[PDB]
Subunit: 82 residues, 6 copies
């Protein structure tokens, strides 16, 4: 088991990931119930500047990026962990 | 029936619905965003990319303004 | 359909109620997923003084009362709605 | 003066603001998103369609990119 | 001075405090429970076992009824 | 396996556990209370009356101090 932020995110996503999609400036990341804030916290700890911000509900996370291009780059980075 | 459950819940919980771009902002009574979000998530609506719920406001994300209008219109039909 | 706070609570509980139990000074009220705050809000709007306060998670509400006797009285009042 | 409460709260909890398209992302101190969101919703500005708050991040949805800038600059005025 | 931040926040958001047994129930303005909870957790007082915050209500769990009173009175000092 | 899932999740998310009276206060990493709460709710533990989760703290309610100790000891066994 690896402990850096990315590895913690990767690990957490193994159990928690449900879906990821994007539209325009935002990524919609769906998690297992009650896991949105947990995953949001790990994401916020990655410190990816391309991520303008994250807003987490209970099982859904919205990641806002400045541009569609930034959104894709962040989505791709997350996808890599899956 | 998910749709019927949502309609029932919206009677008391609904406050406002609007949209811009590819999203719908649905305002509920205080504390109701998650409850309504749970019902909307149970809808079998492919066009609904997801919902993110605060306390009294739900953001419904669709891919496109056209999908957004479709989804909003379907919610409006329940009021 | 009736619209007073109690009737709104009663109505909301028809769909949302899962379990109610108590221990000492507190009631544990379990709801359908994502319904704790919704039910907490209705409960807080009843203005029952015997209720010291409510703290809601996602599907679980803790109602704190000053005494076990108060707790029972509030639990009984809720039970009546079910 | 009506903004004094929001100004006060921002002075203690504001971290950063940015916007993109129809949205403003406002970061607060941990656990302050709902608190600032309530103050923002209380403003009842028609340029703000709504807010969704997480724990430390608020998304404000405005009706247009122009409204978004207008709202963002109004908030920045308070800092 | 280390409590100044919590005092400030309470001055704007505190509604009421009560306690029973091992617990303190602190009511805040809507959406302020997590915000005050964060300030309280930052205190890292060993008399407070922890806090759980809803939207406008914080439950502080202390180790004993005596600790509960001690903590409640410390908080009341700030008002 | 619910227990195994919880154990796996606790590796990263666990911070502190304590108890008083008939409750357990379980502190997790920021933002993890609900995630861990979901796992604990999936345990088939009759003694656990329920959990209420904040942001990083979970309150686990049991009926009695004896049940509380039992439940805490079972959680401690996972660390
Ligand atoms: N258990 C629940 N709260 N379910 C509803 C989730 C609603 C929405 N997807 C959100 O994450 O904010
Ligand atoms: N009682 C409250 N938390 N009010 C603030 C709500 C802020 C925002 N509309 C949301 O639903 O996330
Ligand atoms: N979808 C979830 N968040 N599930 C976990 C709920 C945890 C706990 N029963 C609470 O209501 O706070
Ligand atoms: N302590 C936490 N919950 N941290 C994660 C916050 C995630 C995201 N920025 C939000 O506010 O929803
Ligand atoms: N706007 C709301 N969520 N209101 C209900 C609050 C319920 C309860 N007092 C809590 O803080 O958890
Ligand atoms: N980032 C935060 N919301 N921090 C405050 C947490 C307050 C309290 N321990 C809870 O979990 O509800």
């Amino acid at each position: 088991q690896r402990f850096n932020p990315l590895s913690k995110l990767k690990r957490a996503l193994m159990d928690a990931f449900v879906k990821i999609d994007s539209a325009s400036h935002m990524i919609v990341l769906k998690t297992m119930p009650g896991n949105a804030q947990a995953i949001g916290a790990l994401m916020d700890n990655l410190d990816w500047d391309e991520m303008m911000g994250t807003i987490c509900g209970d099982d859904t996370i919205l990641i806002i990026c400045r541009t569609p291009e930034d959104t894709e780059g962040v989505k791709n980075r997350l996808l890599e962990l899956l």
